[PDB]
Amino acid sequence: MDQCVTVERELEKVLHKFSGYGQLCERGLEELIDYTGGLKHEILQSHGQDAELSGTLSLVLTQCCKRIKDTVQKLASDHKDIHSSVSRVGKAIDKNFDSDISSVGIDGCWQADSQRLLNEVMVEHFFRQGMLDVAEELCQESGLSVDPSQKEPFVELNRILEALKDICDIFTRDACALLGLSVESPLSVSFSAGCVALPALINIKAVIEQRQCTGVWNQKDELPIEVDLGKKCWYHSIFACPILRQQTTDNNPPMKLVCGHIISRDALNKMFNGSKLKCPYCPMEQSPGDAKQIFF
Amino acid sequence: GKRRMDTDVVKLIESKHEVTILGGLNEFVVKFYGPQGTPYEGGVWKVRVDLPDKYPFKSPSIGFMNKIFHPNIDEASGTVKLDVINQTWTALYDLTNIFESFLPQLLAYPNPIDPLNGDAAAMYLHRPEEYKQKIKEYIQKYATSSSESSMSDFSE
Amino acid sequence: AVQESAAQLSMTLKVQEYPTLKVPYETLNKRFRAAQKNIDRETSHVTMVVAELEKTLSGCPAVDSVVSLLDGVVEKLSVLKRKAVESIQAEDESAKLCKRRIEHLKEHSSDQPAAASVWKRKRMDRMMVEHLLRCGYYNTAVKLARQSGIEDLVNIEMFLTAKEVEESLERRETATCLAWCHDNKSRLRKMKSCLEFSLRIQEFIELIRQNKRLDAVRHARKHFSQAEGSQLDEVRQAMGMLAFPPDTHISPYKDLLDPARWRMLIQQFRYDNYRLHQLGNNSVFTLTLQAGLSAIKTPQCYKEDGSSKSPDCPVCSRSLNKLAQPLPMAHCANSRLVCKISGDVMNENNPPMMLPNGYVYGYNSLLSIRQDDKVVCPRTKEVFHFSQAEKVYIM
Amino acid sequence: MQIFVKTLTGKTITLEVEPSDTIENVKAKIQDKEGIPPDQQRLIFAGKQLEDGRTLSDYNIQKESTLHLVLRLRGG
Ligand SMILES: [Zn+2]
Ligand SMILES: [Zn+2]
């Protein structure tokens, strides 16, 4: 919360200056508008014949004019003296936050055929939460229309939730489970994973560009770093062979040696000594034919 | 093959290691800092790594540009002379393993029994104070609000 | 499902929440400049009458010739006070809006687990509202902002203003765009925008079309009298119309009087609005979703067999499966094994055991599935002796 | 107490031991878990090899401490 405090200090300096200047300006202008009003009446007590501007009042009027001038131009400059604080706020905002984050995974990827899918995903997410007003408003403008069979089970949820509104979350979870869905909407999980992953891809793509080695990670079909999302986000089983550091798909399945260690088939074949094979960890000599395929 | 070199270099970069590429991914240089506690503490070296075309399985070549006074490191060229790099290299090691646990371990514990630098081993086996002194020398000698934006005038 | 810490939330804030703080600051700067302009203008106005009274006083005037000037300077001071109070108030309102937004951003560090959830919900809703406004759905965005209770934390006023200006420009109107380009005059001038001149030329053309020549001449003398560079050439080309009827078929006039210059005006306004507020090629929501789908995607999600698909993986769902097809896959240099019988993790505390069939399963799952002295494989439906299982080590 | 062992590949293994347990016992536990013969192991803590025959209290190893595991190495 360092950046927020840094901006908030500058915004506090601005609010205090504005309040002080406003109070000062109001008080000063009220003073003059009233003194000059009092100075007007004075002339009425004195005899009101024309050209009766004696020397006793001319100097007072000149002094009043000089004071009025000097005050107005001072209060006008005092406002311009505040311009530095706003610039400071802007500089702090620019320094403490990122303007362009175009570290896109694929530049020019979702052009026309993916907007419909994204709108469908958002509509499904809005159905899930019971926010059917927003969902219908989005369906009306986007153009897509959902079938009455895929919308009817959610109108009941909307009606019951509106009647209820503790218990709402429990009822929503139970209805979603009984309808044949997941615990959490896929959009929320994807957005959370993106929030976790983006301020690591951005940092690495920059440290890579910093070292003048932008052509290191040539492959464009795989992320350059591994992001940890927790044990709750493990849906599939990944082997990730220790020699090639690659996922063992088919046509190169994991193979168990005589020992308990596992080697990918390609790495096993490329470590052939013509006759005997040695496991990197334990010094046991085996043959390439003594290996059983592993199914995870 | 090449993908393993990609992965190793990327992992080395991510671990906050100063890596400079000279003539492609085959050869580069890395900034290596002396381990804490060892007499080589507080020293900075530049070490060249070259990877053969059967890299994951064929051993890489690692050499010091600068000069190190070690019982088994070439004083002229800089051949590392480690067992896990020359003849006991498996396909499972990577560059991060080297720069994190192999060079520091070699620097901490030398092998003055069948060494590469005869003078260094001879000095270390008999005169530890002289050894420390010479290493200190070599380490000291060879490895060391703006102006405000503009505002315009009013207009009637 | 995804677990996040305070440092990760701070990094996400540093990456994402730039516009929410940039836009109110721009409004504050514009209002402050307008305030300085108004205050200086009223200062000059009062100084004029003060100097007039000062000259008058020298020539031995009468009381009836000074009382009126005193009343006038009183009125000038009063109007100055009122106009300063109103503008300084506007300044304070903008600053307060900035402070409220930064306070809401700072709110994320709550220790309670029942408040970070609603904060994350609000963050997702704000991103969705921004994306919806960028796409062009205004009623849906307003409804979502009202229902989510973030009507203060999102910036819809600028989008609605741009929409209204563009809609008026599409209706063959030439006053709203002019108000917008005079309201943001300093920033438009700094970026070298030539939209006001185009609107003036369009007005001149419109008065030509309905056959009103004297009014067009007066307008050109009012506006086109200080042209230079390409502006002078365009002014000459426009003035060339004064000898033709609005039905000509000649290249420099018929190709210009056609109702296609409105499209150019709309494009120019859209470009100027794009430059005025820094709007990227893609929204934050799209980039975040792309990063998430890349980080979750795994090769087993695109197997034609259909056995590898799971009912929980977000990219295994149909819409996200089709949406995340071109995205880069996830990097994985370390094993992460999940047992098939129970769904738990086969870590060191739960060692993996291979049955002599060739299929691996967890130790705890095997002990919870064994009956009498027998283990049944749940895939091949083949009975196996329990003692035949062999431990498996993962390097 | 809990001890973290950083495997050569990158894996982090958590294990439970006693502060007075000998290093041979730790090597036996690592052999049981990872599957490495104890005759060719090497334990590194703060850049210092853990010589066999000494207890953890001798090397001052506390709870939630990370130590690296490497294969045997020598010079030439
Ligand atoms: Zn083995
Ligand atoms: Zn999946």
UniProtKB/Swiss-Prot annotation, chain A:
Organism: Homo sapiens
Catalytic EC class: transferase
Example of a GO MF term: zinc ion binding
Single GO BP term: proteasome-mediated ubiquitin-dependent protein catabolic process
Subunit field text: Identified in the CTLH complex that contains GID4, RANBP9 and/or RANBP10, MKLN1, MAEA, RMND5A (or alternatively its paralog RMND5B), GID8, ARMC8, WDR26 and YPEL5. Within this complex, MAEA, RMND5A (or alternatively its paralog RMND5B), GID8, WDR26, and RANBP9 and/or RANBP10 form the catalytic core, while GID4, MKLN1, ARMC8 and YPEL5 have ancillary roles.
Name of this protein: E3 ubiquitin-protein transferase RMND5A
Record localization: Nucleus, Nucleoplasm; Cytoplasm
Function: Core component of the CTLH E3 ubiquitin-protein ligase complex that selectively accepts ubiquitin from UBE2H and mediates ubiquitination and subsequent proteasomal degradation of the transcription factor HBP1. MAEA and RMND5A are both required for catalytic activity of the CTLH E3 ubiquitin-protein ligase complex. Catalytic activity of the complex is required for normal cell proliferation. The CTLH E3 ubiquitin-protein ligase complex is not required for the degradation of enzymes involved in gluconeogenesis, such as FBP1.
Origin: domain of life: Eukaryota
Keywords: Acetylation, Cytoplasm, Metal-binding, Nucleus, Transferase, Ubl conjugation pathway, Zinc, Zinc-finger
Swiss-Prot record, chain B:
Substrates-to-products reaction catalysed: S-ubiquitinyl-[E1 ubiquitin-activating enzyme]-L-cysteine + [E2 ubiquitin-conjugating enzyme]-L-cysteine = [E1 ubiquitin-activating enzyme]-L-cysteine + S-ubiquitinyl-[E2 ubiquitin-conjugating enzyme]-L-cysteine; S-ubiquitinyl-[E1 ubiquitin-activating enzyme]-L-cysteine + [acceptor protein]-L-lysine = [E1 ubiquitin-activating enzyme]-L-cysteine + N(6)-monoubiquitinyl-[acceptor protein]-L-lysine
PROSITE patterns (alphabetical): UBC_1, UBC_2
Enzyme class: transferase
UBC core domain residues: 1-144
S-S bridge residues: none
PTM text: Autoubiquitinated in vitro in the presence of NEDD4L.
Record keywords: Acetylation, ATP-binding, Nucleotide-binding, Transferase, Ubl conjugation, Ubl conjugation pathway
Coiled-coil annotated residue ranges, if any: none
EC number of this enzyme: 2.3.2.23, 2.3.2.24
Keyword Iron: no
Catalytic site: 81
Record GO biological process: proteasome-mediated ubiquitin-dependent protein catabolic process; protein K11-linked ubiquitination; protein K48-linked ubiquitination; protein polyubiquitination; ubiquitin-dependent protein catabolic process
Pfam families associated with the record: UQ_con
Quaternary state and interactors: Interacts with MAEA and WDR26, components of the CTLH complex that contains GID4, RANBP9 and/or RANBP10, MKLN1, MAEA, RMND5A (or alternatively its paralog RMND5B), GID8, ARMC8, WDR26 and YPEL5.
Family recorded in the similarity comment: Belongs to the ubiquitin-conjugating enzyme family.
PANTHER family: UBIQUITIN-CONJUGATING ENZYME E2 (PTHR24068)
Name of this chain's protein: Ubiquitin-conjugating enzyme E2 H
Organism of this sequence: Homo sapiens (Human)
Gene label: UBE2H
UniProtKB/Swiss-Prot annotation, chain C:
CDD domains to which the protein is assigned, alphabetical: RING-Ubox_Emp (cd16659)
Cited SUPFAM superfamilies: RING/U-box
EC number(s) on file: 2.3.2.27
UniProt domain LisH: residue ranges: 120-152
GO cellular component annotations of the record: actomyosin contractile ring; cytoplasm; cytoskeleton; cytosol; GID complex; nuclear matrix; nucleoplasm; nucleus
Mapped zinc finger ranges (RING-Gid-type): 313-380
Record-listed Phosphothreonine modification sites: 27
GO terms of biological process kind: cell adhesion; cell division; cytoskeleton organization; enucleate erythrocyte development; erythrocyte maturation; negative regulation of myeloid cell apoptotic process; proteasome-mediated ubiquitin-dependent protein catabolic process; regulation of mitotic cell cycle
Site, as annotated: Essential for ubiquitin ligase activity: 313
Tissue expression pattern: Detected at macrophage membranes (at protein level). Ubiquitous.
Location(s) in or outside the cell: Cytoplasm; Nucleus, Nucleoplasm; Nucleus matrix; Cell membrane
UniProt-recorded Gene Ontology molecular function terms: actin binding; ubiquitin protein ligase activity; zinc ion binding
Keywords from the named record: Actin-binding, Cell cycle, Cell division, Cell membrane, Cytoplasm, Cytoskeleton, Erythrocyte maturation, Membrane, Metal-binding, Nucleus, Phosphoprotein, Transferase, Ubl conjugation, Ubl conjugation pathway, Zinc, Zinc-finger
Reactions it catalyzes: S-ubiquitinyl-[E2 ubiquitin-conjugating enzyme]-L-cysteine + [acceptor protein]-L-lysine = [E2 ubiquitin-conjugating enzyme]-L-cysteine + N(6)-ubiquitinyl-[acceptor protein]-L-lysine
InterPro entries: CRA_dom, CTLH/CRA, CTLH_C, Fyv10_fam, LisH, ZF_RING_GID
Modification after translation: Autoubiquitinated as component of the CTLH E3 ubiquitin-protein ligase complex (in vitro).
Chief location of this protein within or outside the cell: cytoplasm
Domain CTLH: 158-215
Keyword Plastid: no
Location of the region described as Extracellular and involved in cell to cell contact in the Swiss-Prot/TrEMBL record: 1-123
Name this protein carries in UniProt: E3 ubiquitin-protein transferase MAEA
Curated annotation (Swiss-Prot), chain D:
Residue location of crosslink Glycyl lysine isopeptide (Gly-Lys) (interchain with K-? in acceptor proteins): 76
Superkingdom of source: Eukaryota
Membrane-topology annotation of the record: Peripheral membrane protein
Outcome following mutation: residue 63 to R: Abolishes HLTF-mediated polyubiquitination of PCNA
Phenotype when changing residue 76 to D: Impairs ubiquitination by CRL2(KLHDC3) and CRL2(KLHDC10) E3 ligase complex
Native organism: Homo sapiens
Function: Exists either covalently attached to another protein, or free (unanchored). When covalently bound, it is conjugated to target proteins via an isopeptide bond either as a monomer (monoubiquitin), a polymer linked via different Lys residues of the ubiquitin (polyubiquitin chains) or a linear polymer linked via the initiator Met of the ubiquitin (linear polyubiquitin chains).
Full protein name: Ubiquitin
Annotated site residues (Essential for function) in this chain: 68
UniProt effect for mutating residue 60 to R: Decreases affinity for UBE2R2 in CRL2(FEM1C)-UBE2R2 complex
In-chain residues carrying the UniProt-annotated modification Phosphoserine: 65
Domain Ubiquitin-like: 1-76
Cross-link (Glycyl lysine isopeptide (Lys-Gly) (interchain with G-Cter in ubiquitin)): 6, 11, 27, 29, 33, 48, 63
